[PDB]
Tab-separated table of C-alpha atoms and ligand atoms in Angstrom:
chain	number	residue	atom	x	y	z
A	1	UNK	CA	234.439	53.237	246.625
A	2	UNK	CA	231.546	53.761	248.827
A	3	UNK	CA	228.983	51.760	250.493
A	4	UNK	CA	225.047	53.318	251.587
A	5	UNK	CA	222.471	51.329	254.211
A	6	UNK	CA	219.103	52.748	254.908
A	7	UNK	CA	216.411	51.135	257.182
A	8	UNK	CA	213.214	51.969	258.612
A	9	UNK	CA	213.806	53.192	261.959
A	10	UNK	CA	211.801	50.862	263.419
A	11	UNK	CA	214.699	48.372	263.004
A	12	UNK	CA	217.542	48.238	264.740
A	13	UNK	CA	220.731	47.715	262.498
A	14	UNK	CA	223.213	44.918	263.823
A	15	UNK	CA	226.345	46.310	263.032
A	16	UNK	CA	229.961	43.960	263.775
A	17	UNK	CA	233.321	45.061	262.959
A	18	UNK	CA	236.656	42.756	262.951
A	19	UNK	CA	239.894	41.819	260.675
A	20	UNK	CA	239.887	38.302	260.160
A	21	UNK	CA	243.323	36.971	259.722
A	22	UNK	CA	242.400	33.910	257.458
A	23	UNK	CA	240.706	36.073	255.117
A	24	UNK	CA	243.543	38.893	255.205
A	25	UNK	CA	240.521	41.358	255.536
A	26	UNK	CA	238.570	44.112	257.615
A	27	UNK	CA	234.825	42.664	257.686
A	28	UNK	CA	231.791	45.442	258.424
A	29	UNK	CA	229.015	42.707	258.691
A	30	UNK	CA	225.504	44.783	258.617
A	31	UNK	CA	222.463	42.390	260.058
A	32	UNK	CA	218.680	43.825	259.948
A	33	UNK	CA	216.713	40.942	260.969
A	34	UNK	CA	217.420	38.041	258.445
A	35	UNK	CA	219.101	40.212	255.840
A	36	UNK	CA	222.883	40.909	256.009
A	37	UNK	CA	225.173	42.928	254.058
A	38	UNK	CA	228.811	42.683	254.011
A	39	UNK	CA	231.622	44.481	253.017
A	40	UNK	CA	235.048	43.521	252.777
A	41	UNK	CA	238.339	45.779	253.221
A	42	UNK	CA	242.199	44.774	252.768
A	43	UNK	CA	244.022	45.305	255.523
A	44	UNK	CA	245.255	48.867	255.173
A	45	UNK	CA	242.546	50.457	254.040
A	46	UNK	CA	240.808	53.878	256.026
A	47	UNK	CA	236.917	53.407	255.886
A	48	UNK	CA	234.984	56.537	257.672
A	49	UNK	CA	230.968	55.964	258.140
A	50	UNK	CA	228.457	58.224	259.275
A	51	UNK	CA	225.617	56.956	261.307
A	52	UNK	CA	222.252	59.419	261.074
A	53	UNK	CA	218.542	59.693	261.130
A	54	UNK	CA	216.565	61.057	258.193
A	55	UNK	CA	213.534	62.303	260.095
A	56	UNK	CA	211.575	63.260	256.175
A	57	UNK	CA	211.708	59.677	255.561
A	58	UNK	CA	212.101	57.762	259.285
A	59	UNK	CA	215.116	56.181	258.015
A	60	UNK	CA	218.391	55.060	260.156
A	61	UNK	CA	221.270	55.206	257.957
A	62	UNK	CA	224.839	54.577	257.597
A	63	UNK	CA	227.462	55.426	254.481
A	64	UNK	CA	230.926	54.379	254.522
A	65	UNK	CA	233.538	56.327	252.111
A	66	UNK	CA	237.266	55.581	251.367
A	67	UNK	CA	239.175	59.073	252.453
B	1	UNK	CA	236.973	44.633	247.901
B	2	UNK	CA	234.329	42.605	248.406
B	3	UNK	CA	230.614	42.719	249.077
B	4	UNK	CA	227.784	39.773	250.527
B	5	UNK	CA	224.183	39.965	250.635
B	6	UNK	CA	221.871	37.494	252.061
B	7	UNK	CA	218.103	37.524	252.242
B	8	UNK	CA	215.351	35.206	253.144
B	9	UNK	CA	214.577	33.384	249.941
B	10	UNK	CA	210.831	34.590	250.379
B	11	UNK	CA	211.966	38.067	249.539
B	12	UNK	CA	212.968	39.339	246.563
B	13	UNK	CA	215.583	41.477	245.613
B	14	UNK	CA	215.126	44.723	243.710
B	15	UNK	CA	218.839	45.290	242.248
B	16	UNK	CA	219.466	48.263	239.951
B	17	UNK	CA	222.336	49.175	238.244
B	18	UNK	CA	223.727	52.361	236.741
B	19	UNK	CA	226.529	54.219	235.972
B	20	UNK	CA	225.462	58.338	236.934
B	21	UNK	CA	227.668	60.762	235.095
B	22	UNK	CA	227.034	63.473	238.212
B	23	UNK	CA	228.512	61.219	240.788
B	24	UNK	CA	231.117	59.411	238.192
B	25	UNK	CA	230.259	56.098	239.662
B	26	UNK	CA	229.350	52.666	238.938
B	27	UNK	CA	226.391	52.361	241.117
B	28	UNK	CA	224.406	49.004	241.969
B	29	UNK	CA	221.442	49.300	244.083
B	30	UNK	CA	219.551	46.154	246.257
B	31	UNK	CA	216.465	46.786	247.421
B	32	UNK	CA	214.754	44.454	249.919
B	33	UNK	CA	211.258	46.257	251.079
B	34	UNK	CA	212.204	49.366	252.878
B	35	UNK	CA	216.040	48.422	253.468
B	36	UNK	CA	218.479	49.667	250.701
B	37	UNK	CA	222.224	48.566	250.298
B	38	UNK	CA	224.215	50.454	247.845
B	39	UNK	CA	227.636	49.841	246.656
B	40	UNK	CA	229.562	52.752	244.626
B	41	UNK	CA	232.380	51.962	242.100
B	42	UNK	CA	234.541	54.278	239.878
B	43	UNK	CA	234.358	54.896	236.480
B	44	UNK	CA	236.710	52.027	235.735
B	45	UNK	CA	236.798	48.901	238.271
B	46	UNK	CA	235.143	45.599	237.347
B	47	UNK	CA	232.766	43.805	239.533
B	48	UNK	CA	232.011	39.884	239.258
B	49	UNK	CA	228.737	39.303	240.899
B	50	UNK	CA	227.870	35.962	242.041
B	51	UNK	CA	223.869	35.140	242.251
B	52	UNK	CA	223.006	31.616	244.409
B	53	UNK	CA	220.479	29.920	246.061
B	54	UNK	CA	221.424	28.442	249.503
B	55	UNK	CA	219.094	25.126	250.086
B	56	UNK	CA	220.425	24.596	253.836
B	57	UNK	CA	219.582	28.317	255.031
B	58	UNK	CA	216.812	28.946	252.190
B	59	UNK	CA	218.480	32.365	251.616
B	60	UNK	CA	219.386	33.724	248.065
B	61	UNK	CA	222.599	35.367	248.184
B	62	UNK	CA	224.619	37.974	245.857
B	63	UNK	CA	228.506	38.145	246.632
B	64	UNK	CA	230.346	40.525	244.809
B	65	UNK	CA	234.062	40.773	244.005
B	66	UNK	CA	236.594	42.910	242.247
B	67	UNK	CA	238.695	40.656	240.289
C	1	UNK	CA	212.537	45.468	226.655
C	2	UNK	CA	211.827	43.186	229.322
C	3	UNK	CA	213.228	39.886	230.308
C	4	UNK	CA	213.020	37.158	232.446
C	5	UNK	CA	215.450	34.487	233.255
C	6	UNK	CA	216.187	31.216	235.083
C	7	UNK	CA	218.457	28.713	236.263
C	8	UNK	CA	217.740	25.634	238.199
C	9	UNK	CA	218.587	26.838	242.330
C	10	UNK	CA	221.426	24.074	242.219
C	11	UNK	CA	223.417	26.215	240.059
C	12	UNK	CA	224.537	30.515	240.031
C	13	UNK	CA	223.620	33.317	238.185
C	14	UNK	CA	227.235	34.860	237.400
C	15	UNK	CA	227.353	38.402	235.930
C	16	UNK	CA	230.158	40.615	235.442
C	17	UNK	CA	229.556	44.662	235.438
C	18	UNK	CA	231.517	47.603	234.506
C	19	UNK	CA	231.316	50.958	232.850
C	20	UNK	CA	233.668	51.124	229.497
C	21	UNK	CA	234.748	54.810	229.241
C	22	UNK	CA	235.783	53.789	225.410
C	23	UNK	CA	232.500	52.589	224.353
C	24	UNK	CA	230.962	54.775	226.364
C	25	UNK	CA	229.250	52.188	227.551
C	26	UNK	CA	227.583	50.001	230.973
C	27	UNK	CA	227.953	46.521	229.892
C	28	UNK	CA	226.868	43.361	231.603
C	29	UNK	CA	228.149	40.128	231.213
C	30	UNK	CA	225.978	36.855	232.345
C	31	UNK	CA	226.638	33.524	232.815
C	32	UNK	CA	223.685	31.417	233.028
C	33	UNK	CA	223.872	27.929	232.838
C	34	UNK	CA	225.160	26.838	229.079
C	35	UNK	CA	224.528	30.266	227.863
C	36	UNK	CA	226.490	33.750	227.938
C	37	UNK	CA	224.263	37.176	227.413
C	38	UNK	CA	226.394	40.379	226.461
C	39	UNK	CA	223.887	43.485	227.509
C	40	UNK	CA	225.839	46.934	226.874
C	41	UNK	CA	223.832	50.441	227.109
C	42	UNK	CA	224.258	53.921	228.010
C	43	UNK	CA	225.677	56.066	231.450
C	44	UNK	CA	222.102	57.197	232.959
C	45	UNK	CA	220.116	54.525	232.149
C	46	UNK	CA	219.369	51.983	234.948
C	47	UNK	CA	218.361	48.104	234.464
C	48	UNK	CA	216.360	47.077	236.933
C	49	UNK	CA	215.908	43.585	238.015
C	50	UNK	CA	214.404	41.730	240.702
C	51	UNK	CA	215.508	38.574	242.323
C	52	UNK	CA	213.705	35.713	243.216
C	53	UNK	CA	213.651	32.281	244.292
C	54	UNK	CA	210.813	30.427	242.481
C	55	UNK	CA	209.305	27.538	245.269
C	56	UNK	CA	207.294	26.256	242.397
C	57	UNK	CA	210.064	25.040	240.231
C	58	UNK	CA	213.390	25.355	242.225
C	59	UNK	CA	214.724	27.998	240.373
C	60	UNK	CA	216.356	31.177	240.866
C	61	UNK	CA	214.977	34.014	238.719
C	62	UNK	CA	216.008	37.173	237.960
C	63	UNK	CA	212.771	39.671	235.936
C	64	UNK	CA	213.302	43.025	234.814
C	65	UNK	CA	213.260	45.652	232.545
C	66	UNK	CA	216.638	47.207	230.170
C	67	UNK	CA	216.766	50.568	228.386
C	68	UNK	CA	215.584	51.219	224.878
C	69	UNK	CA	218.725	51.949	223.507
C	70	UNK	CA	220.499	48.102	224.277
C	71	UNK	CA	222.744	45.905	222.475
C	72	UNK	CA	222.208	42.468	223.329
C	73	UNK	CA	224.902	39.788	222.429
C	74	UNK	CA	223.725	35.566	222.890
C	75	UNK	CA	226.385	32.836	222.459
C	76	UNK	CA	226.175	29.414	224.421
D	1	UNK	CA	233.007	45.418	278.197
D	2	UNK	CA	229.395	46.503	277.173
D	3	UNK	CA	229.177	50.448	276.193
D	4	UNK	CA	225.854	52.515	275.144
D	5	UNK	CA	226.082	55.708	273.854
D	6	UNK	CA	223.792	57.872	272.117
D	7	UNK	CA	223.489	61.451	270.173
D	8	UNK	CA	220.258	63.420	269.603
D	9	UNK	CA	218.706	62.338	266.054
D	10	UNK	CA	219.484	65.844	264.312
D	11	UNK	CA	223.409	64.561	264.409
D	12	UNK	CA	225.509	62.591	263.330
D	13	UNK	CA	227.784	60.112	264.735
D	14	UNK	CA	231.092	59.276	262.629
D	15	UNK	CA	233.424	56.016	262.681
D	16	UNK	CA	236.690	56.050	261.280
D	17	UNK	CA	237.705	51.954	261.195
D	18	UNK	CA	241.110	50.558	259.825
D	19	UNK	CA	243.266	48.118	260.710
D	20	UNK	CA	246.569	49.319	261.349
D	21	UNK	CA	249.225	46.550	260.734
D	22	UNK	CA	252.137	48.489	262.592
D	23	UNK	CA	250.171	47.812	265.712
D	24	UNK	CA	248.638	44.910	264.968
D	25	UNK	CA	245.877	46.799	266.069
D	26	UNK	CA	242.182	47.408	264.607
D	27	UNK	CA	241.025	51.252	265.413
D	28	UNK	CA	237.839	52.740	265.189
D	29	UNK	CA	238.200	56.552	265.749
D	30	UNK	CA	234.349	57.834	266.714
D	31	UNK	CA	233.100	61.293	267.146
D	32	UNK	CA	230.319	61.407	269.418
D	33	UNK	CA	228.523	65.350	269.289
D	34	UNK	CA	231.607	67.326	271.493
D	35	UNK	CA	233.761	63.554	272.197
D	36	UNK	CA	235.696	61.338	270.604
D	37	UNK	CA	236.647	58.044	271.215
D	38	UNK	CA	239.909	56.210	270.287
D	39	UNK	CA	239.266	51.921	270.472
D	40	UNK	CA	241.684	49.893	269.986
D	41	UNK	CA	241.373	46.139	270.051
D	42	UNK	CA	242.870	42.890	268.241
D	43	UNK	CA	242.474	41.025	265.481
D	44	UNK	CA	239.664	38.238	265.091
D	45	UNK	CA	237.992	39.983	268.221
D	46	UNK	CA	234.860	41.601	266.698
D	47	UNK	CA	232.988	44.492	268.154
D	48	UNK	CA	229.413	43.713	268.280
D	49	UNK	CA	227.275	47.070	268.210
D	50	UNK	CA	223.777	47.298	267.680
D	51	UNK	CA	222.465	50.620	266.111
D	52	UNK	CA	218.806	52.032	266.942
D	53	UNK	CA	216.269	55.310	266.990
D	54	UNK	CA	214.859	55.970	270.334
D	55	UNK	CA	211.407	57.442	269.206
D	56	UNK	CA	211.424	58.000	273.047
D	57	UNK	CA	214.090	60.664	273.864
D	58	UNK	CA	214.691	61.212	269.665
D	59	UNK	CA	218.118	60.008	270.136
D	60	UNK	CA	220.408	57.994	267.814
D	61	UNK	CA	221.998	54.558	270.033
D	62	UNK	CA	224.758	53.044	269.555
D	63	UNK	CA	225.126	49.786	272.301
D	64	UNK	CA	227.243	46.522	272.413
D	65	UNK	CA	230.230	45.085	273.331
D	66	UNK	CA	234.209	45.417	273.329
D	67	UNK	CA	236.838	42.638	273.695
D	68	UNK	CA	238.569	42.215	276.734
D	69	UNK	CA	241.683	43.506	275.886
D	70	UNK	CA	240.606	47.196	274.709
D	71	UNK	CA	242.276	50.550	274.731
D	72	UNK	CA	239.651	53.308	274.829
D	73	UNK	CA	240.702	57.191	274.465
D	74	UNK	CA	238.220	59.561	275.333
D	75	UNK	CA	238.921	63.353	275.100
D	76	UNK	CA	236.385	66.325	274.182
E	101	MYR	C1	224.055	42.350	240.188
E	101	MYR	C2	222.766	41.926	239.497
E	101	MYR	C3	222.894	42.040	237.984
E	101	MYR	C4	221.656	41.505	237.274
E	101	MYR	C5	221.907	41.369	235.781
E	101	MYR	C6	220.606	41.207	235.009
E	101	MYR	C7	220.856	41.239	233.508
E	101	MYR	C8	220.274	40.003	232.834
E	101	MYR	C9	220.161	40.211	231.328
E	101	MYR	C10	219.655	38.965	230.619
E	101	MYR	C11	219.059	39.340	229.270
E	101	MYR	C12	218.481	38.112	228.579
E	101	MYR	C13	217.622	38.503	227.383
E	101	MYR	C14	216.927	37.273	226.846
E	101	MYR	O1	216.229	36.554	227.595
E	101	MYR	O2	217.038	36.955	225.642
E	102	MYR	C1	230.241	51.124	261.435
E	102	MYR	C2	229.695	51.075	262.857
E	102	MYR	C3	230.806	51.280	263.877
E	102	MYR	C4	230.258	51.356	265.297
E	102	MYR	C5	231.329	51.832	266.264
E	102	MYR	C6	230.938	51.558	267.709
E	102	MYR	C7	232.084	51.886	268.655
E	102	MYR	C8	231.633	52.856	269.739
E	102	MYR	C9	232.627	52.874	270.895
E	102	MYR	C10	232.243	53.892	271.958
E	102	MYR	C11	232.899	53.531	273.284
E	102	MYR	C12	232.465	54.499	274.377
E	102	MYR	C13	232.861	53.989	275.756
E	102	MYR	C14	232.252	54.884	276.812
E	102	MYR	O1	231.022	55.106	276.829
E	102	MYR	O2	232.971	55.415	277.686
């Protein structure tokens, strides 16, 4: 289970973090302008992500594993 | 395990999917101009997309769950 | 093999993925409107679709293009 | 509670995030080049970051805000 987000650098990458007890889940909400992608996580699950820069390609970009 | 995208319904979504035999994943791709979203799945997990139009926020919208 | 597909933006495009290690298989299931397509082909072959919202007709389309090598099931 | 903090572009900064229920306690766990952080905050409080390049000083930034009630760890 992994999750990948690549922008152009030029963007900047609204990224929001909570556990939302209604839903029983850990939310990573991803905003770039008017697109937004979600992922949802029960509530005892480890998620690490690495934030970088691809300087070949001018990308931002963040990838999430389960460890 | 869930995932939510959301664009604005003048874009278009470039979704690919594949299973690759190197990384032994279910992989589904969205594309929306130069930002990419990727979600990884193993060999053997089932995932129930949901494709919608929203008419109050004129966004198209793919949730995904694993039922 | 490509294809192009629509449903009126009032209603959702539902479609079911996985890999089947028995058949060896990537299969796609879709729900859309009355009718259900079965798509099944191999590991390392990609479909690749594109999403759209057509203002002209208030629909929600989905165009694209599916390996050589598919088995395509229609039942409504 | 606003926080900035920034790494130069050719590393990598890396979030652990869970929520831990003995706690009752979401944790985010961040490396930071030679630092990490420990946060600790509670549920249905988000933490509102917003990632960026600097072409300026070639830098990777991380800035936003905490909840009110946060623990934060810090130790190199
Ligand atoms: C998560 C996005 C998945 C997109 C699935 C696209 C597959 C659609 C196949 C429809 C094939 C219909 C063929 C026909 O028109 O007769
Ligand atoms: C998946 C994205 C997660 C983003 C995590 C942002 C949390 C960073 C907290 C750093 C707090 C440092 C406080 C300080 O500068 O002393």
């Amino acid at each position: 289970m992994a999750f990948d987000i690549s922008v152009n650098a030029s963007k900047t990458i609204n990224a929001l973090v909570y556990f939302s007890t209604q839903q029983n889940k850990l939310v990573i909400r991803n905003e770039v302008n008017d697109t937004h992608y979600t992922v949802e996580f029960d509530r005892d699950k480890v998620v690490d992500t690495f934030i970088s820069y691809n300087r070949h390609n001018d990308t931002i970009e963040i990838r999430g594993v389960l460890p």
